[PDB]
């Protein structure tokens, strides 16, 4: 993550966030959404990072410092790429969103009215046939990724070496590998939860509660679909138990 | 410091994220209550052994019977919640989260936690399920439904008062290392 974007989400809520005289203007209502908004960013800004611990951190560094095949990689950290890609683009349009709502004078005052627009876009077309493609191809190879990794740390020195080595600070407490790969699998299952905590709070203006009503909507359908998308692959599984 | 895995399941609104929460947070959340949780790692000292005990929540993936097991793989505990306000979420406890636990995690110790203990003495509470002809969970039906489940043991907590809850963490730790 970046500086800028980790102070900007530092606090424990919207409302420790901004300037307490700029909490002091706004009512109740508006708090509490913008509470449950600010938890939608800064958990994406959370899950962006994790995938960037896992394209830079662990592929990356598995490539330039092991004599592993490039294949033993790819099932450790399956579509890592794509992920990164999807993620890191919905969260520059949610950090725009924000910086655009801010009070001139401020770098933390803001309050964003307008959040389904963006949900309806993400969760649509084409962009909602990567994510569910995307997600039914890496859930279906997350047993494989950690049985792959639970077999390199125990037969290979070097590797178990490897690890030891790059998940020893503090701040990578709760970022394994296979800790990562789950992070990754659940994220998914959050939007609607998020999504309509944020409805609740959102009745105000009508446009805005039909926009997250029809997005919330969009995730619970791509989420019935990876569900339907997915079977798990196993490392050296015969034709005679995949077609039985 | 052994490294440890913890699964919390139930049915939705059973309190679990909260507990979670309330757990791995150093002060009580007065401002906001977040709405997920993402995964934490606990340092627990316990009867003189070292443990790091990893968080795990299954809200958000009750609906979706192919995602919800992913969250299973090296489970050393699972935590197996219901709501004492809700005599539904235990009638679910034998019929659903036991046999999906018992196959995804065969030898996994379950601990049977109920949840929101105040709401037993809740006014409110006992008005709504009275409408119903229903009560709160008693303490003996929660005993009786972890002996019959198999249950490594049954333990009561308030997420709210904070009342019971390292104590959940502190048990669950030790069956993990049995
Ligand atoms: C634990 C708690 O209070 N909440 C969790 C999910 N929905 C909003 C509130």
Redesign the pocket.
């Known amino acids: 993550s970046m500086e800028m974007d980790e102070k900007d989400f530092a606090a424990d809520s919207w409302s420790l966030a901004v300037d307490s005289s700029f909490l002091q203007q706004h009512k109740k209502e508006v708090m509490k959404q913008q509470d449950?908004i600010y938890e939608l960013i800064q958990t994406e800004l959370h899950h962006v990072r994790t995938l960037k611990i896992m394209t830079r951190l662990f592929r990356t560094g598995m490539l330039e410092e092991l004599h592993l095949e490039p294949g033993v990689v790819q099932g450790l950290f399956p579509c890592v790429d794509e992920l990164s890609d999807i993620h890191t683009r919905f969260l520059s349009q949610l950090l725009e969103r924000r910086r655009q709502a801010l009070c001139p004078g401020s770098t933390r005052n803001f309050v964003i009215h307008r959040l389904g627009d963006l949900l309806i876009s993400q969760f649509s077309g084409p962009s909602a046939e990567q994510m569910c493609k995307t997600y039914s191809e890496f859930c279906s190879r997350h047993s494989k990724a950690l049985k792959l990794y639970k077999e390199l740390y125990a037969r290979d020195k070097r590797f178990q070496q490897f690890i030891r080595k790059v998940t020893r600070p503090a701040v990578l407490k709760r970022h394994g590998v296979q800790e990562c790969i789950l992070l990754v699998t659940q994220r998914i299952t959050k939007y609607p939860?998020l999504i309509?905590?944020i409805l609740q709070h959102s009745h105000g203006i009508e446009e805005e509660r039909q926009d997250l009503t029809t997005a919330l909507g969009l995730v619970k359908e791509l989420l019935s679909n990876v569900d339907e998308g997915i079977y798990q692959l196993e490392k050296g599984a015969r034709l005679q138990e995949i077609y039985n | 410091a052994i490294r440890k895995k913890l699964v919390i399941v139930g049915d939705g609104?059973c309190?679990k994220?909260?507990?979670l929460?309330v757990f791995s947070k150093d002060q009580f959340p007065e401002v906001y209550?977040?709405?997920?949780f993402e995964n934490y790692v606990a340092d627990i000292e316990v009867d003189g052994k070292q443990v790091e005990l990893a968080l795990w929540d299954t809200?958000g993936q009750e609906d979706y019977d192919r995602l919800r097991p992913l969250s299973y793989p090296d489970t050393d505990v699972i935590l197996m919640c219901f709501s004492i306000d809700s005599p539904d979420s235990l009638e679910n406890i034998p019929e659903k989260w036991t046999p999906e636990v018992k196959h995804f995690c065969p030898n996994v110790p379950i601990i049977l936690v109920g949840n929101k203990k105040d709401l037993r003495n809740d006014e409110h509470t006992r008005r709504e399920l009275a409408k119903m002809k229903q009560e709160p969970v008693k303490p003996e039906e929660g005993r009786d439904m972890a002996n019959r489940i198999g249950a490594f043991g049954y333990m009561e907590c308030s997420?709210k008062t904070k009342d019971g809850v390292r104590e959940v963490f502190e048990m669950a730790t030790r069956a993990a290392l049995q």
């Not at chain 2, 209550?33 to 997920?36: D, L, N, R």
């Open positions: 449950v939860l309509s905590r | 609104a309190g994220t909260c507990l929460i209550v977040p709405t997920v809200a997420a």
